[PDB]
Every structure is written in structure tokens, then in C-alpha cells.
């Protein structure tokens, strides 16, 4: 029980791409079971467990992060500053 | 559609209302009850006082119309969604409808694509037999 | 309210991601495929011909092959006055026996006006 | 910030055996607003006349949030009814473009043009 | 005329709108659970710097 609200809240911190950059840094996406975490993680994109999600980007980095080639290119702060001020200027 | 600009408006009244109290607390009329201008103090006419009291003022009024008015112009007076989702229901069953004609208007120029191709196959088939 | 998101979910989508059209292209690049490829030749080849009809007494013989028009003239020098060209703008690939036939090549592109080329290529091998 | 620390739950192993289990979830108002926003006016009258009054302009003005929002859905719910009515328009537009070559087609067929 | 007007009707089709059948349709049905979705996670809209995390981190 305590996983999921934790679950939950990863996913809201998934919207935030300084988290991710972060994560790329220390190397956790070279991991095959984080890869295979984050499929499990596609379950909060449906109605009912969205329900608890107040924010739209982490759909969205969940889905872009699962082509292998954006985690090469989220190791570069470049590319991570690029998507941070797209959130920004989009809002 | 028209109440997104009802907050909009509502919002820049309250912006208007601190504006307000900004304007007729270090300013004011110049009363000679108390000969004031005759020292320290500092100065500061009538003229735009009234003015900026008088313009704020007006755009309580201004609001006041938009707020009454728009609150009236809201379509579907309900509190409730089951006569609005029987209703949502009808035309989305007319958009089946619509769909099942789709079906057929995609087949009929599907139809006309081959119905107007098969003459051009079958004088083709005249242009290869003299040539021939 | 924010009612795109709450169809994004049902849709396990998002909304304010696909109004940004060059962030969505940058990372990701597109893949191929061979049957597609076939597809996309036929289509464009039926536009080959179209275009064709409307224009070379020797070229009127042609091949249209697997990806590519081909034209056959007789020639010298351990191969013959070949051309291909798909795309009036084509593209063209020429097959023969090395750098002086590239200098060719580039001229035919540069010239790249059909006749002019059958002219010109006829010229060089005369 | 440390990621997670259940790391042999989603592990690939697990999942080339079988996914984990997944986890459980966790009218009105215009009558409203046509007299509160006048009795909002008064205070600003009540005001000068007499601190708390700067205190209760929100303390009278949250009313309006509490109402406002109640009915804000059904704008977005009547703006659902002239959306959804379009994609029968979307779909006619196709039916109406191609009706009018349909004729034209048929006229085309009868006729040498 | 008569090739010029076949890729015309075929274009003036819409094609495949199996697609928009299924995806269009599902959002529709349903119309009154959809508004009821959006009422209870309104506002949703304003960064997250690791104030929220914390507390779950803890």
C-alpha cells in the first residue's frame, strides 16, 4: 500500500524534468528493471488512477522517456534545460 | 465561452479595487477647514482626485453591466446532467447516423472510383487492339 | 477546467504535448519499411509514366526497375551510356565501368532539358 | 531525492515471468450574485463611513467562489453540446462535398463533359 | 477529365476513419462521465521542487 501512494507521487515527480535529468545523471535508466518499472507505470494513464494526478506532463515524460534514445539525451543538461523552459513558456 | 470572460472581468474589478484604495488615501481635496497648505504637509488638488475617485467609480458600473448581463446569457439554465446527457445522447446517435452514411458515402465514391476506372480499363483495352 | 487532460487519460495521452510539432521530432527518429517501400515505388511510378507521356528516338526503350527508372544507351569504355532517374525534377543514378564518370554525373544533375542531356550524352560518347 | 527503493518488484525478471500485480486505487446562483455583489458595494460604503472591513471584503467576497463554480461546470458541459454537434457537421461537410460530385459525377456520366 | 476527377473523389473521401470511428465514439461512450471526471480535479493547472517529495520520501 505504501509502494503505490509512493507510486503516485513518483509519477507526479515524473512531470518535473529537472527530477528526471537528475536521475539520468546518477545513471538509474541504465538499469533494465527501471526501463521495466516504468511500463508498469503506463497504468496511471488511464481514468481511474489519474484520477489522483492533478498535472498532465508526467504522461507525457513517461511516454517520451521510453524511447532509448531520449534517455541518452536527457544525460546532457542542455536537453534538460531545453524541455524545462518549454513547460514554462507553455505556461 | 462567455463565463471564461465573466472571471476575467470579475478578476480586473478586484485588481480595479485595490487601485481604489490607492489613490484616495495620500490624495484629497484641499479643504480649508484646517488651512493645511500653509505648511510640512504636501499638496495635492481637487481636480484629480475627483477624476480617478469618479473613473473608478464608473468601472464598478462598467462591471456591474458585464457581471449582470452575462450572468443572464448562460444557455441550458440547469443543475442537473441527466437531462443534459439524454440529450447529449440524442445527436451522437445521429452522428452514427451521420456515421452510416459516411460508410456509404465512402463507398459510393469508392464506387464512383471504379465505376468511371472501368471505362478507362475497358478503352484501354480499345486503345490496344488497333495499335496491336 | 481542464477538460483535453480528462480525455487524455481515457486516451492514455496528452493534450499539450502534440501543439509543440519540432520537440516531438528531435529525439525520435522514423523507420522504414520494405513493403512500404514497394507501395511508395508503385505510387510514384504511376506519376513517372504520367509525366513521361508527355515528353529521343533510342531512349524510348526503358526499364522502370526496383526503385528506380533505367535507360540503356550503347557505349565505350567497359560499360555502356546508362541512366536511371527517379523523381519536371528527376533524380538520377547512372550505372557504368571512375571519377571522370562522376564528373558526368554531377554535369547530368546540373543539367538536370531531357533531350539536351540525350544530346549531350550522345555528344561526349561520339 | 533517492528514486524508489522497490527495485525487485517490476524487476525485467519478474516481468519475463509475469507482470506484478497491479496496484489498487486509492438559477441559484444568479440569485445569489445579484445580491451579493451589491451588498459587496456596501461594505465598500460601510467602510469609509467607519482593520476588519479590509479583512471582510474576501470574508464577504468568498460567497462568490463557493457559487461561481458550481455552475461553471455546466458552461463546459453546454460547450460539451456545441462540440459534439460539429462532428456530425465534420461528417456531413464530407457527405455535402461529395454529394455535390455525386450529381456532378452522374451529370458527367450522362454527359460528354 | 475523367483521371483528373478519380484522384479527386478518391481524396475528397475521408479514409480509414475506423480510427476516428473507435477514438471519437470511446470519448463520447461516456458523455456524462467525463464531466463527471473533470468536476473533482478541476483546476489542475498552476514546477514540483521536491516540496511534495519529501514528504513521501520520508
Redesign the interface.
Known amino acids: 500500500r505504501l509502494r503505490f501512494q509512493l507510486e503516485l507521487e513518483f509519477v507526479q515527480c515524473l512531470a518535473n524534468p529537472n527530477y528526471l535529468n537528475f536521475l539520468a545523471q546518477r545513471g538509474y535508466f541504465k538499469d533494465k528493471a527501471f526501463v521495466n518499472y516504468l511500463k508498469y507505470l503506463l497504468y496511471w494513464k488511464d481514468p481511474e488512477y489519474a484520477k489522483y494526478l492533478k498535472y498532465p506532463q508526467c504522461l507525457h515524460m513517461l511516454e517520451l522517456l521510453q524511447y532509448e534514445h531520449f534517455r541518452k539525451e536527457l544525460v546532457n543538461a542542455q536537453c534538460a534545460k531545453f524541455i524545462d523552459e518549454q513547460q514554462i513558456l507553455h505556461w | 465561452?462567455?463565463?471564461?470572460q465573466?472571471?476575467d472581468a470579475?478578476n480586473s474589478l478586484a485588481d480595479q479595487?485595490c487601485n481604489a484604495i490607492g489613490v484616495l488615501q495620500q490624495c484629497g481635496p484641499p479643504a480649508s477647514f484646517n488651512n493645511i497648505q500653509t505648511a510640512i504637509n504636501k499638496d495635492q488638488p481637487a481636480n484629480p482626485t475627483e477624476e480617478y475617485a469618479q473613473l473608478f467609480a464608473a468601472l464598478?458600473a462598467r462591471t456591474?453591466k458585464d457581471?449582470?448581463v452575462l450572468?443572464?446569457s448562460?444557455?441550458?439554465?440547469?443543475?442537473t446532467?441527466?437531462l443534459?446527457?439524454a440529450?447529449?445522447?440524442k445527436?451522437?446517435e445521429?452522428?452514427?447516423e451521420?456515421?452510416t452514411?459516411?460508410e456509404d458515402?465512402?463507398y459510393?465514391?469508392?464506387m464512383?472510383?471504379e465505376?468511371?476506372?472501368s471505362?478507362?480499363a475497358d478503352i484501354a483495352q480499345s486503345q490496344l487492339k488497333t495499335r496491336s | 477546467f481542464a477538460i483535453p487532460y480528462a480525455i487524455d487519460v481515457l486516451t492514455t495521452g496528452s493534450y499539450p504535448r502534440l501543439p509543440t510539432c519540432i520537440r516531438d521530432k528531435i529525439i525520435p527518429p522514423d523507420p522504414i519499411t520494405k513493403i512500404e517501400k514497394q507501395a511508395t515505388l508503385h505510387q510514384l511510378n504511376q506519376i513517372l509514366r504520367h509525366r513521361l507521356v508527355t515528353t529521343p528516338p533510342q531512349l524510348a526503350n526503358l526499364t522502370v526497375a526496383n526503385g528506380r527508372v533505367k535507360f540503356r544507351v550503347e557505349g565505350e569504355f567497359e560499360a555502356t551510356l546508362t541512366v536511371m532517374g527517379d523523381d519536371e525534377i528527376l533524380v538520377e543514378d547512372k550505372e557504368t565501368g571512375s571519377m571522370q564518370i562522376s564528373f558526368i554525373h554531377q554535369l547530368v544533375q546540373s543539367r538536370l532539358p531531357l533531350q539536351d542531356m540525350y544530346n549531350c550524352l550522345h555528344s561526349f560518347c561520339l | 531525492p533517492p528514486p524508489m527503493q522497490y527495485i525487485k518488484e517490476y524487476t525485467d525478471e519478474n516481468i519475463q515471468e509475469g507482470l506484478a500485480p497491479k496496484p489498487p486505487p486509492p438559477?441559484?446562483?444568479?440569485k445569489e450574485?445579484?445580491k451579493l455583489?451589491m451588498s459587496i458595494?456596501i461594505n465598500f460604503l460601510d467602510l469609509l463611513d467607519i482593520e476588519e472591513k479590509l479583512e471582510d471584503?474576501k470574508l464577504l467576497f468568498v460567497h462568490?467562489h463557493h457559487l461561481?463554480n458550481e455552475?461553471?461546470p455546466?458552461?463546459a458541459?453546454?460547450?460539451?453540446?456545441?462540440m459534439?454537434?460539429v462532428?456530425?457537421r465534420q461528417?456531413?461537410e464530407?457527405?455535402e462535398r461529395?454529394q455535390k460530385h455525386?450529381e456532378r459525377?452522374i451529370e458527367m456520366?450522362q454527359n460528354c463533359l | 477529365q475523367?483521371?483528373k476527377?478519380?484522384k479527386e473523389?478518391?481524396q475528397?473521401?475521408?479514409?480509414a476513419?475506423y480510427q476516428a470511428?473507435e477514438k471519437l465514439?470511446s470519448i463520447?461512450?461516456?458523455?456524462?462521465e467525463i464531466?463527471?471526471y473533470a468536476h473533482r480535479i478541476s483546476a489542475s493547472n498552476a514546477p514540483y521542487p521536491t516540496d511534495l517529495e519529501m514528504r513521501s520520501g520520508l
Do not use: W
Open positions: 465561452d462567455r463565463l471564461t465573466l472571471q470579475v479595487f464598478i456591474a457581471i449582470d450572468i443572464d448562460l444557455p441550458s439554465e440547469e443543475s446532467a441527466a443534459q446527457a440529450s447529449l445522447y445527436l451522437e445521429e452522428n452514427h451521420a456515421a452514411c459516411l458515402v465512402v459510393r465514391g469508392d464512383l472510383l465505376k468511371i476506372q471505362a478507362l | 438559477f441559484d446562483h444568479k450574485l445579484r455583489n458595494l471584503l462568490v461561481i455552475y461553471r455546466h458552461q458541459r453546454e460547450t460539451l453540446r456545441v459534439m454537434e462532428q456530425k461528417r456531413l464530407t457527405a461529395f455525386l459525377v456520366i | 475523367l483521371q476527377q478519380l473523389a478518391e475528397i473521401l475521408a479514409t476513419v470511428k465514439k463520447e461512450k461516456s458523455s456524462e464531466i463527471k
